Design a protein around this ligand. Structure first.
Ligand SMILES: [Mg+2]
Ligand SMILES: [Mg+2]
Ligand SMILES: [Mg+2]
Ligand SMILES: [Mg+2]
Ligand SMILES: [Mg+2]
Ligand SMILES: [Mg+2]
Ligand SMILES: [Mg+2]
Ligand SMILES: [Mg+2]
Ligand SMILES: [Mg+2]
Ligand SMILES: [Mg+2]
Ligand SMILES: [Mg+2]
Ligand SMILES: [Mg+2]
Ligand SMILES: [Mg+2]
Ligand SMILES: [Mg+2]
Ligand SMILES: [Mg+2]
Ligand SMILES: [Mg+2]
Ligand SMILES: [Mg+2]
Ligand SMILES: [Mg+2]
Ligand SMILES: [Mg+2]
Ligand SMILES: [Mg+2]
Ligand SMILES: [Mg+2]
Ligand SMILES: [Mg+2]
Ligand SMILES: [Mg+2]
Ligand SMILES: [Mg+2]
Ligand SMILES: [Mg+2]
Ligand SMILES: [Mg+2]
Ligand SMILES: [Mg+2]
Ligand SMILES: [Mg+2]
Ligand SMILES: [Mg+2]
Ligand SMILES: [Mg+2]
Ligand SMILES: [Mg+2]
Ligand SMILES: [Mg+2]
Ligand SMILES: [Mg+2]
Ligand SMILES: [Mg+2]
Ligand SMILES: [Mg+2]
Ligand SMILES: [Mg+2]
Ligand SMILES: [Mg+2]
Ligand SMILES: [Mg+2]
Ligand SMILES: [Mg+2]
Ligand SMILES: [Mg+2]
Ligand SMILES: [Mg+2]
Ligand SMILES: [Mg+2]
Ligand SMILES: [Mg+2]
Ligand SMILES: [Mg+2]
Ligand SMILES: [Mg+2]
Ligand SMILES: [Mg+2]
Ligand SMILES: [Mg+2]
Ligand SMILES: [Mg+2]
Ligand SMILES: [Mg+2]
Ligand SMILES: [Mg+2]
Ligand SMILES: [Mg+2]
Ligand SMILES: [Mg+2]
Ligand SMILES: [Mg+2]
Ligand SMILES: [Mg+2]
Ligand SMILES: [Mg+2]
Ligand SMILES: [Mg+2]
Ligand SMILES: [Mg+2]
Ligand SMILES: [Mg+2]
Ligand SMILES: [Mg+2]
Ligand SMILES: [Mg+2]
Ligand SMILES: [Mg+2]
Ligand SMILES: [Mg+2]
Ligand SMILES: [Mg+2]
Ligand SMILES: [Mg+2]
Ligand SMILES: [Mg+2]
Ligand SMILES: [Mg+2]
Ligand SMILES: [Mg+2]
Ligand SMILES: [Mg+2]
Ligand SMILES: [Mg+2]
Ligand SMILES: [Mg+2]
Ligand SMILES: [Mg+2]
Ligand SMILES: [Mg+2]
Ligand SMILES: [Mg+2]
Ligand SMILES: [Mg+2]
Ligand SMILES: [Mg+2]
Ligand SMILES: [Mg+2]
Ligand SMILES: [Mg+2]
Ligand SMILES: [Mg+2]
Ligand SMILES: [Mg+2]
Ligand SMILES: [Mg+2]
Ligand SMILES: [Mg+2]
Ligand SMILES: [Mg+2]
Ligand SMILES: [Mg+2]
Ligand SMILES: [Mg+2]
Ligand SMILES: [Mg+2]
Ligand SMILES: [Mg+2]
Ligand SMILES: [Mg+2]
Ligand SMILES: [Mg+2]
Ligand SMILES: [Mg+2]
Ligand SMILES: [Mg+2]
Ligand SMILES: [Mg+2]
Ligand SMILES: [Mg+2]
Ligand SMILES: [Mg+2]
Ligand SMILES: [Mg+2]
Ligand SMILES: [Mg+2]
Lengths: 221, 116, 48, 118, 121
RNA sequence: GACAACUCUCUCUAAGGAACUCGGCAAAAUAGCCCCGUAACUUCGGGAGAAGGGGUGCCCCCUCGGGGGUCGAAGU
RNA sequence: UUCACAUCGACGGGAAGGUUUGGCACCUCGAUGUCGGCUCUUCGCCACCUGGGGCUGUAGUAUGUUCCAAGGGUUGGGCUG
RNA sequence: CAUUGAGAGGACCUUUCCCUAGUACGAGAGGACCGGGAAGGACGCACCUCUGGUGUACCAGUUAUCGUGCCCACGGUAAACGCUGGGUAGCCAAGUGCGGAGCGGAUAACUGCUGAAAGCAUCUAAGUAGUAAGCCCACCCCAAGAUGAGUGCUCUCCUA
RNA sequence: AGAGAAGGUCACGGCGAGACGAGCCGUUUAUCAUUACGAUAGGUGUCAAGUGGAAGUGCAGUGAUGUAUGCAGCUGAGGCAUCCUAACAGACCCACAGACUUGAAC
């Protein structure tokens, strides 16, 4: 999954409504930022086998960090940071450890982004909620209701299939949301407003990249 | 699920849980310290404090509010008497919770809630 | 649904050992707790 | 310098002051008879006039909202207005009605008579 | 939110008092008639001695819902009843004069119908 | 104690209103009192509480039911 | 219209399948049990629609027939065990 | 701590309308291929700003009745709300967004170019060209128990 | 054998994480003086928000009731402040410079 362009990380602050001059109301997510988005490490095809750049995000007290990690960020000469992440480019010449990213440079207005985040955990969920199973009859004689159904065929094959859909734990995962739009950037509050919903509740941690378009931003294969 | 449902259920239905909490507070304000289960204590914090904050203002309105919570009048009047004196400078935080050895019969974790 | 067969001596011995391992973690909590109450410095804890 | 929860509340205060600057908005409660004039994206010549009673007011941020009920040609119509909308031009209080609730949803079930204005 | 078996008030002269929707058209397999969709209805109750007999299959466009229409102003509209107007396959109303309010949302596909309206919303 | 799936005992549900189903099964709806009104049919006893409609709280005043007020979204 | 082979194809023949109605009685009799709906799958291709083609008695639109193709789709009701 | 990705999965669906153009085609009536653009359907992934549902956290009315000495005012009960009218946070859809991209690779049928065996011909025997919702990569999650257990950065191994 | 490496588990305060384990965040709560990083939960103060005009005392009324004091009173699962309470006391696991061979280098 080679990624087009450097991304940045941010924090979901919650959603509000935002007008346009002509009275079109757009619901927008407001994505805040914190001190960070500092290039931590750079990986050369020679050295690592591939081309990538590790940006750290959330700053932090030095105590809370572990000695291996602190010693990772003193090799860089950067401030202590909670979350590290990698972006995979096809060319890294522009980047030095300790270099800083600004989201005002990378993202203009009306540009397309891709928001990766972690989803709301809904816990252990039934067949209905998890796979949209139609529920069986509520009344005439029927004892089933929200139950799973039959789970397989008869004597043959005589075992349930792999991956046959069943109740299990739902949510709480890395999820991409493709091709969103950027409505407004506030330099004052350093915030980015985005049309639509992004995963997870406020206080979340997001990763925004310039949108991969399978024809035109990416290696053909 | 519950996301951000904050209440203490105490494994009882609404009515009972109310009455239980009222009871436990008239107990704490009568005796000044008591021995209960960790959950009951933690749940009871809020209502203890509601009563104290109530008495700090002293208005007839507030006094009728407390009267309609605590069961025993006498404890209420004594509350409105003592509190300005004892707690006047304390902003919040009127209760200490000190845990102990668990119970013998069920091994339910115990606790000591103190009027501090 | 019933047990078509009877459970082999050794497998049962493993399942019951698992259930006996919980006694081990409760023994660590118990030990740590005694070493706490044995310095008499804890104001969060009380014994009579 | 701004902490983040602050940012969330602050952006609404900014947008509502910036919106109340161009176009000052009346005090408007439930039970008020109201006249509103909309600029439509088509039909520049005349601005559409909606009269009616306010059945409810939901307070949120910039998107704060008003619900207007009126009987039109014997068909009950309720309409919802974003208050700080740019496409609204004038709004005013025609008259006040005396009501005890925070929302009158009971107007549906009553007679046409109470919803009748102008 | 008109769906099959729903009853509807007729908004025009055409001589039907009530319709029962049996289908929704052009929406492929959607089950919801919302404002400005063509539904196939049948006539339940009619106005006597009129060109329209009860138990007729006819086309109508849905002009009023109890569900709520959202324009882009953030503006919202909710009527007190369901109503549709009986048409041709040409877009022209069979009956010549319409009651009630309508919306500017119908101006695109139906000119005739917005023309004959006593009020526009 | 905790507050998953799921089953059971219950409350509520936007638009629609039997499209469910073997079948309106189960639910929901109706309900007391006073007043007006009450069909085919009949063994003239019935049908019949047919159907369908109105009134109902709390205050004063009059006659021993009537008028006036006043709350509530709603008065057995 | 002419023209067997666009499309049909009489009289006959050569096959595949194992979904119909059957023959057999190898099978299980103790509590290895038939048809419809619900829920939930899954696979075949003899392709109904969607993708590409050849021929036409294909002007065009729409067909007809056939080739490759099973990725996806395949409604809601009145009626019946 | 951060990752490569063998392998595994999810999803790559479809309809009307509008330009092209009333252009080819036809005597007319009718009416295109190809390639662009919008709106829909179903399905999938998220979400709560709006519209709502619930919301036994709360707020208000209100009947019966027993408590708090009595009026006032509150408390209990009318299962697991007495009955109603509202509702924030949550969860939710009927609400809101987004998705289905590939002058990438190799093929099936088929259309082909050079061209022999048969001094002619022939899409095939040499060699090669187009081309499918199919096949494979790309897209989206998982993933080194991938025992073939990967690579990368950093940290730590005291005292006698 | 003493000690307790890096780290982990436990304990303790928690959650937009959770059937349980797991996950994640905290654990003396800074200093500042020019950024951010040292408030986890509860309480308290204030604010968004909800409900819809408290109780008491006045006035009007024969009275039920209305009206003023007053966007009141209650609530505030959400934000922001503030260490007032509880994050006390602590415990356990854990430290043969990494067997053997062969080349290359020095
Ligand atoms: Mg969760
Ligand atoms: Mg169903
Ligand atoms: Mg059942
Ligand atoms: Mg087997
Ligand atoms: Mg009760
Ligand atoms: Mg009870
Ligand atoms: Mg509180
Ligand atoms: Mg709202
Ligand atoms: Mg009045
Ligand atoms: Mg008929
Ligand atoms: Mg006129
Ligand atoms: Mg329970
Ligand atoms: Mg409903
Ligand atoms: Mg309804
Ligand atoms: Mg309805
Ligand atoms: Mg109906
Ligand atoms: Mg029927
Ligand atoms: Mg039926
Ligand atoms: Mg059916
Ligand atoms: Mg019944
Ligand atoms: Mg019932
Ligand atoms: Mg009901
Ligand atoms: Mg009645
Ligand atoms: Mg009733
Ligand atoms: Mg009579
Ligand atoms: Mg007769
Ligand atoms: Mg009689
Ligand atoms: Mg009869
Ligand atoms: Mg009678
Ligand atoms: Mg009757
Ligand atoms: Mg009868
Ligand atoms: Mg009645
Ligand atoms: Mg009545
Ligand atoms: Mg009355
Ligand atoms: Mg009077
Ligand atoms: Mg009266
Ligand atoms: Mg009234
Ligand atoms: Mg009345
Ligand atoms: Mg032949
Ligand atoms: Mg035999
Ligand atoms: Mg058996
Ligand atoms: Mg085939
Ligand atoms: Mg085809
Ligand atoms: Mg063909
Ligand atoms: Mg032809
Ligand atoms: Mg297929
Ligand atoms: Mg398939
Ligand atoms: Mg299929
Ligand atoms: Mg069918
Ligand atoms: Mg970490
Ligand atoms: Mg990865
Ligand atoms: Mg792969
Ligand atoms: Mg494997
Ligand atoms: Mg794949
Ligand atoms: Mg594709
Ligand atoms: Mg021409
Ligand atoms: Mg096209
Ligand atoms: Mg689409
Ligand atoms: Mg919402
Ligand atoms: Mg919200
Ligand atoms: Mg409600
Ligand atoms: Mg809500
Ligand atoms: Mg008494
Ligand atoms: Mg009493
Ligand atoms: Mg009560
Ligand atoms: Mg009692
Ligand atoms: Mg009883
Ligand atoms: Mg009940
Ligand atoms: Mg309620
Ligand atoms: Mg959607
Ligand atoms: Mg190709
Ligand atoms: Mg080829
Ligand atoms: Mg050829
Ligand atoms: Mg040649
Ligand atoms: Mg040739
Ligand atoms: Mg060849
Ligand atoms: Mg293809
Ligand atoms: Mg495609
Ligand atoms: Mg490894
Ligand atoms: Mg090995
Ligand atoms: Mg190796
Ligand atoms: Mg250590
Ligand atoms: Mg814990
Ligand atoms: Mg752990
Ligand atoms: Mg400590
Ligand atoms: Mg706090
Ligand atoms: Mg907090
Ligand atoms: Mg008052
Ligand atoms: Mg009250
Ligand atoms: Mg008086
Ligand atoms: Mg308010
Ligand atoms: Mg401080
Ligand atoms: Mg302390
Ligand atoms: Mg070595
Ligand atoms: Mg050696």
């Amino acid at each position: 999954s080679v990624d087009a362009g450097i991304g940045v990380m941010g924090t979901k602050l919650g959603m509000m409504s935002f007008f346009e001059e002509d009275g079109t109301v757009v619901p927008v997510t407001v994505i805040g930022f914190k001190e960070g988005n500092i290039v931590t490490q750079v990986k050369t095809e020679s050295t690592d086998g591939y081309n990538a750049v590790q940006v750290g995000y959330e700053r932090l007290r030095d105590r809370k960090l572990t000695m291996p990690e602190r010693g990772h960020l003193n090799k860089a000469g950067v401030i202590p940071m909670r979350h590290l992440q990698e972006f995979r480019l096809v060319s890294v010449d522009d980047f030095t450890p300790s270099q800083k990213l600004l989201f005002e440079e990378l993202f203009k207005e009306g540009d397309m982004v891709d928001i990766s985040g972690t989803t709301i955990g809904k816990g252990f969920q039934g067949g209905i909620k998890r796979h949209n199973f139609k529920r069986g009859l509520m009344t005439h004689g029927s004892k089933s209701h929200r139950a799973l159904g039959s789970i397989g065929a008869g004597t043959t094959p005589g075992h349930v299939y792999k991956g046959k859909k069943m109740p299990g734990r739902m949510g709480g995962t890395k999820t991409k949301i493709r091709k969103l739009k950027i409505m407004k950037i506030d330099t004052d509050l350093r915030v980015v407003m985005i049309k639509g919903a992004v995963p997870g509740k406020p206080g979340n941690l997001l990763r925004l990249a310039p949108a991969k378009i399978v024809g035109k931003n990416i290696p053909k294969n | 699920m519950k996301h951000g449902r904050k209440i203490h259920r105490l494994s009882r239905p609404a009515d009972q849980r109310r009455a239980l909490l009222r009871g436990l507070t008239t107990q704490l304000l009568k005796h000044g310290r008591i021995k209960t289960t960790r959950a009951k204590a933690s749940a009871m914090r809020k209502y203890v404090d509601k009563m104290i904050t109530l008495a700090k203002e002293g208005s007839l309105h507030k006094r009728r509010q407390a009267l309609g919570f605590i069961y025993e009048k006498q404890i209420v009047h004594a509350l409105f008497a003592e509190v300005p004196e004892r707690y006047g400078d304390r902003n919040g935080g009127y209760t200490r919770i000190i845990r102990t050895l668990p119970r013998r019969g069920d091994n339910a974790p115990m606790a000591y809630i103190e009027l501090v | 649904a019933v047990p078509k067969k009877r459970t082999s001596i050794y497998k049962k011995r493993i399942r019951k050992n698992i259930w006996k391992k919980k006694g081990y973690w409760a023994a660590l909590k118990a030990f740590s707790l005694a070493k706490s109450l044995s310095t008499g410095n804890s104001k969060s804890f009380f014994v009579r | 310098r701004v902490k983040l929860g602050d940012i969330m509340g602050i952006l609404n205060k900014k947008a509502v002051h910036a919106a109340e600057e161009l176009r000052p908005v009346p005090g408007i409660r439930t039970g008020d008879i109201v006249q509103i004039r909309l600029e439509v994206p088509e039909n520049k010549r005349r601005l559409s006039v909606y009269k009616g009673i306010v059945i409810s007011r939901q307070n949120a941020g910039i998107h704060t909202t008003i619900r207007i009920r009126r009987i039109i040609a014997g068909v009950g119509v309720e309409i919802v207005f974003p208050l700080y909308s740019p496409n609204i031009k004038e709004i005013k209080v025609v008259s006040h009605r005396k009501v005890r609730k925070a929302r009158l949803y009971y107007l549906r079930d009553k007679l046409p008579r109470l919803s009748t204005f102008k | 939110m008109i769906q099959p078996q729903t009853h509807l008030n007729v908004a025009d002269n055409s001589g039907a008092r009530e319709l029962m929707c049996i289908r929704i058209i052009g929406a492929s397999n959607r089950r919801y008639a919302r404002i400005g969709d063509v539904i196939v209805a049948v006539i339940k109750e009619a106005i006597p001695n009129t060109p329209l007999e009860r138990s007729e299959v006819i086309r109508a466009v849905v002009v009023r819902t109890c569900k709520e229409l959202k324009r882009d102003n953030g503006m919202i509209i909710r009527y007190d009843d369901n109503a549709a107007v009986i048409i041709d396959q040409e877009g022209n109303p069979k009956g010549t004069r319409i009651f009630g309010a309508i919306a500017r949302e119908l101006r695109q596909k139906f000119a005739k119908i917005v023309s004959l309206a006593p009020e526009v919303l």
